[PDB]
Amino acid sequence: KEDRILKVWTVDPLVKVFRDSEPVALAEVARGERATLQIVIRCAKPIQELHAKVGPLALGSNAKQVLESAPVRFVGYVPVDRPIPRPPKDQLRRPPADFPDPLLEEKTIAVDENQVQPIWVTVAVPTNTQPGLYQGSVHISGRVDGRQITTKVPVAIKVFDIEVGQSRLWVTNWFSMQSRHMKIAPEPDSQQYWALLSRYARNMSEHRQNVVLVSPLSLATFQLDMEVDFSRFDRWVRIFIAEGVIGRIEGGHLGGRSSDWESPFVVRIKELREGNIITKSVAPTSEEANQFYAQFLPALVNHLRDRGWLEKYAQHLADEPVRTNIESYRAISKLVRKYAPELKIIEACHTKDLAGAIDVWVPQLNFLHNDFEHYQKRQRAGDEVWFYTCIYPQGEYANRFIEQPLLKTRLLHWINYRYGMTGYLHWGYNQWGKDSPFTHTTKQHTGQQYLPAGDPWIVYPGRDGPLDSIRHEAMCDGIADYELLSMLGERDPEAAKRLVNRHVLDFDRYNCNVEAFRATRLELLELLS
Ligand SMILES: CC1=N[C@@H]2[C@@H](O)[C@@H](O)[C@@H](CO)O[C@@H]2S1
Ligand SMILES: [Cl-]
Numbered sequence: 036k037e038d039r040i041l042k043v044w045t046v047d048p049l050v051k052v053f054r055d056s057e058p059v060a061l062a063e064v065a066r067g068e069r070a071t072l073q074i075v076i077r078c079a080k081p082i083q084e085l086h087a088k089v090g091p092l093a094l095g096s097n098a099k100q101v102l103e104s105a106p107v108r109f110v111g112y113v114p115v116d117r118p119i120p121r122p123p124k125d126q127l128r129r130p131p132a133d134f135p136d137p138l139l140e141e142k143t144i145a146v147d148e149n150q151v152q153p154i155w156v157t158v159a160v161p162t163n164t165q166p167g168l169y170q171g172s173v174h175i176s177g178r179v180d181g182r183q184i185t186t187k188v189p190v191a192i193k194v195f196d197i198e199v200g201q202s203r204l205w206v207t208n209w210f211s212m213q214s215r216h217m218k219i220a221p222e223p224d225s226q227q228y229w230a231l232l233s234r235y236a237r238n239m240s241e242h243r244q245n246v247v248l249v250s251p252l253s254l255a256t257f258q259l260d261m262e263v264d265f266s267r268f269d270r271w272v273r274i275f276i277a278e279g280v281i282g283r284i285e286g287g288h289l290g291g292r293s294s295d296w297e298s299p300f301v302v303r304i305k306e307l308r309e310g311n312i313i314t315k316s317v318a319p320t321s322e323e324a325n326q327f328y329a330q331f332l333p334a335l336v337n338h339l340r341d342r343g344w345l346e347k348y349a350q351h352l353a354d355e356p357v358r359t360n361i362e363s364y365r366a367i368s369k370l371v372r373k374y375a376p377e378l379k380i381i382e383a384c385h386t387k388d389l390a391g392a393i394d395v396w397v398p399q400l401n402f403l404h405n406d407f408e409h410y411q412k413r414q415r416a417g418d419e420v421w422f423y424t425c426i427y428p429q430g431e432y433a434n435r436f437i438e439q440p441l442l443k444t445r446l447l448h449w450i451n452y453r454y455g456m457t458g459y460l461h462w463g464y465n466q467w468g469k470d471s472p473f474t475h476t477t478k479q480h481t482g483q484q485y486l487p488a489g490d491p492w493i494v495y496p497g498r499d500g501p502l503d504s505i506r507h508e509a510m511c512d513g514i515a516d517y518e519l520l521s522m523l524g525e526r527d528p529e530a531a532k533r534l535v536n537r538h539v540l541d542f543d544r545y546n547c548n549v550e551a552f553r554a555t556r557l558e559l560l561e562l563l564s
Contacts, residue, residue, distance in 0.1 A: 038079045038080050038180075039078070039080060039179045039180055039182060039184060040078070040079075041076055041077075041078050041082075041175070041177075041179075041184050041186055042058060042076065042077045042078065043074065043075070043076050043175070043186055043188060044058045044059050044074075044075050045059075045060040045072065045073065045074055045075070045188065046059055046073045046075050046153070047073065047549050047553070048071040048072070048073040048155070048441075048505070048508070049440075049441045049442055049445070049509070049549045049552065050073075050441070050549060051127055051134065051135050051440075051441060051505070052073070052075055052110065052135055052151060052153045053128065053132075053133070053134070053135070053151065054112065054133060054150050054151050055151065056075070056151050058075075058077070060072045060073075060074060060173075060188065060189070060190040060191070061190075061191045061192075061193065062158070062190075062191075062192045062193070063192075063193050063195070063553070063556060063557055063560060064160055064192065064193070064194060064195065064560075065160075065194070065195050065197040065198065065199045065515070065519065065560060065563075066160055066161070066162050066163070066164045066166065066194055066195070066196070066197065066198050066199065067160065067161070067162040067198055067199035067200055067515070068160055068199055068512075068515050069157060069158065069159050069160065069508070069511060069512065069515075070102075070157070070158040070159075070160055070192045071155065071156065071157055071158075071508060071512075072155075072156040072158075072173075072190050073110075073153055073154070073155055073156075074087070074153070074154040074156065074173060074175070074188050075151055075152070075153045075154070076146070076151070076152050076154065076175065077149065077150070077151045077152070078146065078148065078149075078179060078184075079148060079149060080148050080179050080180055081145065081146065081147055081148050081179070082145065082146040082152075082177045082178070082179055082184075083145055083177060083178040083179075084143040084145075084176075084177050084178050085109075085143055085144050085145070085146055085152065085175070085176075085177040086142065086143045086175070086176050086177060087107045087154050087156075087173050087174065087175050087176075088107070088173070088174045088176075089104040089107065089156060089158075089171070089173050089174075089190075090171040090172045090173065090174060090187075091171050092104065092158065092169045092170065092171040092190070092192060093169060093170065093171060094165060094167045094168070094169055095167065095168055095170065096167065097165075100165050100167070100169075101169075102158050102160060102164065102169050102192060102194075103158070103159070104156065104157070104158050105156075105157040105158065105159060106140065107154060107155070107156055107173075108138040108139055108140060108154075108155045108157070108503075109138075109139045109141055109144050109152065109153070109154060109155070110135045110137075110138065110139070110152070110153035110154070110155055110505070111135070111136065111137035111138070111139045111473070111495075112133040112134065112135055112136075113133065113134055113136050113137065113437070113472075113473055113474075113476050113488070114131065114132075114133050114474065114476060115130045115131065115132055115133070115134050115437055115438065115476050115477070115488045116130060116131050116476065116477055117130055117131075117477045117485060118130040118438065118487070119429050119436055119438055119439075119487045120429065120487075121429035121430050122429070122438065123429075123430065123431055123438075123439060123443075124431065125439070125440055125547060126438050126439070127438055127439070127440060128438070130438065130488075134437045134438070134488070135153060135505060136437050136488075136489070136495075136504045136505060136506065137473065137495045137502055137503075137504055138155055138502055138503045138504060138505065138507075138508070139502065140497055140498075140502060143177075146177075154173070154175070155505075156173060156190070157508075158192060159241075160192070160194055162198050162199070162200060164194055165194075166194050166195060166196035166564075167193075167194060168191060168192075168193050168194075169191065169192045169193075169194060170189070170190070170191045170192075171189075171190060172187040172188055172189050172190060173187065173188045173190060174186075174187050175187075175188065195560040195561075195563070195564045196564050197519070197522075197560060197563040197564050199515050199518050199519060199522075200518075201245070201518075202243050202245075202514045202515060202517055202518035203457075203517075203518060203521055204243075204245075204448060204451060204457070204458060204459065204514055204517045204518065205245060205246055205283060205421065205457060205458030205459070206243060206244050206245055206246060206458065206459050206460075206514055207244065207246035207247065207248060207285055207458075207459075207460045207461070208239065208244055208460075208461050208462075208463070208464035208493065209248045209460075209461070209462045209463070209464055209466075210235060210239070210247065210248065210464040210465060211464070211465055211466060211467075212228075212231075212232055212235070213465070213467070214231060214496075215467050215468075215469075215496060216467060216471055216472065216496035217496045217497065217498060217499060217500075218498040218499060219231065219498070219499045229270070229274070231499070231500060232271070232274055233274050233277075233278055234499070234500035234501070235465075235500065235501055236274055236275050236277075236278035236279075236280055237278045237279075238494065238500065238501045238503075239278075239280050239464070240278050240279035240280045241511075242503075242507055242508075242510065242511040242514075243510075243511050243514040243515065244280055244282075245280060245281070245282035245283065246280070246281075246282055246283045246284075246285050246458075247271075247275045247280050247281060247282070247284065247285060248285040248286075248287055248351075249268060249271050249272060249275075249284055249285065249286065249287060250268075250286070250287025250288075251265070251268055251286055251287065251335050251350075252287065252289065252303055252305075252331075253287065254267040254268035254271060255267065255268055256312075257305045257312050258312075259305065259306070259307040259312060261305075261327075261330040261331065261334070263331065263334045263335075263338070265338050269342065272284060272342075272344065281347065282347070283347050283348070283349065284344060284347050284348045284349075285348075285349060285351065285381060286348060286349060286350035286351055286381075287351060288351040288352065288353055288354055289302050289303060289350070289351070289352055289353065289367060289371075290302035290303060290316070290319065290352060290353040290367050291303075291316075291353050291354065292353075292360070293316065296357070296481075297357065297359040297360060298360065299318070299360050299362075299363035300319065300352075300353045300356070300360055300363040300364050300366075300367060301316035301317060301318060301319070301363075302316065302317060302318075302319050302324050302328070302353075302367055302370070303315070303316055304316075304317055304323055304324060304326075304327035304328075305327060305331075306323070306327070318363070318366075319363055319366035319367045319369075319370060320366050324370065325370070328370045328371075328374055329374055332370070332371060332374040332375035332378070333374060333375065335375065335378075336375050336377055336378060345377065345378075348378070348379065349378075349379040349380065349381040349394065349395050350371060350375075350378050350379065350380050350381065351380075351381055351382060352364065352367040352368060352371065352380060352382060352393075353367055353382075354382070354383055355383055355384065355385055356382065356384055356385065356386050356389070357385045357386055358385075358386050358388070361386050361388060361389075364386075364389070364392070365389075365392055368380065368389075368392035368393065372392075379394045379395060380392070380393045380394050380395070381393065381394070381395035381397065382395070382396070382397060383397040383398075383399070383423050383460060383462075384396060384397060384398055384399075384402075385398070385399060385402055387402075387406045387409050387410075390413070390416075393418075394418055394419065395418070395419040395420075395421065395458075396410060396413055396418060396419065396420045396421065397420075397421045397422060397423050397458075397460050398410065398420070398422055398423075399422065399423055399424070399425070399427060399428065400422050400423070400424050400428055400432055400433070400450070400542065401427065401428035401432055401542075401543070403420075403422045403454075403456070403542070404542035404543060407454070407542075410456075411455075414455065419457055419458065420455075420456055420457065421456055421457060421458035421459060421460055422450075422451075422456050422459065422460070423459070423460040423461060423462070424447065424461060425461070425462055425463070425490060426480065426484075426486055426487065426490055428543075429487070430543070431543045431544060432542070432543045433446050433447050433450060433545060434447075434489075434490075435447070435461070435463075435489050435490075435493065435506050435510070436487045436488060436489040436490065437476065437487075437488040437489040437506070438487070438488065438489070439489075440547045441505060441506065441509045442509075442538075442545070442547040442549065442552060443545065443547060444506045444509040444510055444513065445509040445510070445512055445513035445516065446513065446538055446539060446545050446547070447459060447510075447513060448510075448513035448514050448516055448517040449513065449516065449517070449520075449535055449538050449539045450539050450542065451517055452516075452517050452520045452521070452524075452531075452535050452539075453532075453535045453536065453539040454542070461493070463490050463491045463492055463493060464492065464493060464494060465492050465493075465494050465496075465501060466478075466491040466492055467491070467492055467496060468491075472491075472492055472495055472496065473495065476488040478490075478491045489506060492504075493506055493507045493510065494507060516556075516559075519559055519560075519563065520534065520535055520559065522563060523559060523562060523563055527562065530562060534555055534558060534559055537551070537555050538551075538552060538555060
């Protein structure tokens with residue numbers, strides 16, 4: 036009987052729990068935020084059919100007022116085989132090691148003996164929820180050595196009388212419409228294809244993404260006696276409006292590197308050759324580039340204006356310009372300024388020498404830190420400044436690598452608040468390769484480089500749509516934190532500064548103490564209520 040006893044504990048959801056973690060549930064939220072609870076179990080014998088059910092979470096003053104809970108998810112583990120090459124001091128464990136990341140959507144799971152297993156409870160709290168203290172329990176059941184085991188864990192959610200609606204922060208995660216590794220494989224233009232696209236869009240909006248990257252070149256068809264048909268593009272845009280993302284439309288890149296890292300940029304064009312529309316890359320100063328873009332850009336602008344989408348749209352030229360290919364970059368910009376002067380231009384950038392050439396700057400975080408005075412000047416001049424993270428930066432900078440503390444994902448949006456950057460970009464929503472992302476966590480990059488685990492995807496392939504990671508959850512939470520700090524700063528700018536300054540000490544230095552963070556959150560909620 037002793038060996039059948041289930042050990043149960045609760046762990047803050049900002050703390051990652053390993054299979055061999057040592058034993059150690061209240062959530063404090065605004066109306067409109069998501070509450071998360073992490074319940075952890077272990078047993079000296081194997082468990083079959085582990086299951087959890089959330090009971091009614093009811094208000095003490097009125098048992099009729101209930102919160103609605105999402106289906107319970109189990110934390111999944113992935114093997115991180117190779118490390119961040121320049122790791123942070125606070126790296127959670129040294130690879131190789133198994134890390135918690137995916138949120139699985141299984142009704143029941145098995146657990147091997149003496150393996151710690153986290154259970155993840157999500158409660159989305161609508162804005163019209165009555166403030167108060169909601170209480171209930173989670174019922175955990177399963178089978179051990181034949182016999183049914185069952186236990187109830189008490190939980191509480193305090194809903195503060197402060198409404199967090201849409202966050203004013205702009206957030207994009209670049210997305211690839213693909214069904215790799217899923218149990219479905221829809222063909223383009225099938226009903227299931229459009230249904231899966233809608234499911235991704237809903238996932239993105241439920242995590243406070245409000246920008247989507249959509250290519251006006253690859254989602255159009257061309258006839259060239261030029262006529263451009265944007266039907267496919269428009270279907271994408273409609274779906275992302277309907278599911279609550281758009282928001283803003285980020286136009287897919289016109290061009291890219293001709294070869295290696297310092298090579299000149301080329302632009303894609305469409306041409307009639309031997310009766311067929313063909314696509315090729317040309318120099319942006321070429322006559323072929325001029326002929327194409329003189330007709331395509333006005334068609335795009337006219338199309339966006341007619342649909343009421345022009346003021347929501349910004350166009351990418353070519354990714355990550357550097358000093359050594361700045362001239363070819365500037366030649367793309369010149370085409371767009373010439374033939375589409377009304378179009379806003381956005382770019383993830385390394386070089387800063389682009390004044391007049393772009394409207395929405397998106398420097399890489401360490402480049403922003405290093406050139407902060409330039410970026411603040413661009414803001415005074417009326418430009419928008421965001422930032423991104425990716426394979427870089429590494430070291431002590433915040434990022435969404437699996438090896439990092441979860442607060443480094445969440446505090447990215449505290450960096451946005453402290454330094455006045457009004458949006459955030461990441462390239463890596465779901466960039467799964469041919470190998471399973473559950474078993475091959477370090478994707479191949481340029482030459483001998485690999486991408487650190489966590490960089491290419493924040494969601495995983497489920498049976499028929501995306502599965503969240505814990506990092507996706509932390510990102511959503513930070514985007515809401517930004518809105519709360521912004522609401523406080525409207526009323527009490529000095530109090531908002533003091534609170535953000537407790538966790539963002541510099542661009543590359545933070546306080547990731549979870550107890551401290553929860554204390555700051557509670558002060559923020561108390562001040563606003
Ligand atoms: C905006 C960006 N562009 C690049 C992407 O296409 C990927 O190669 C990524 C790898 O981390 O690095 C940077 S982030
Ligand atoms: Cl270790």
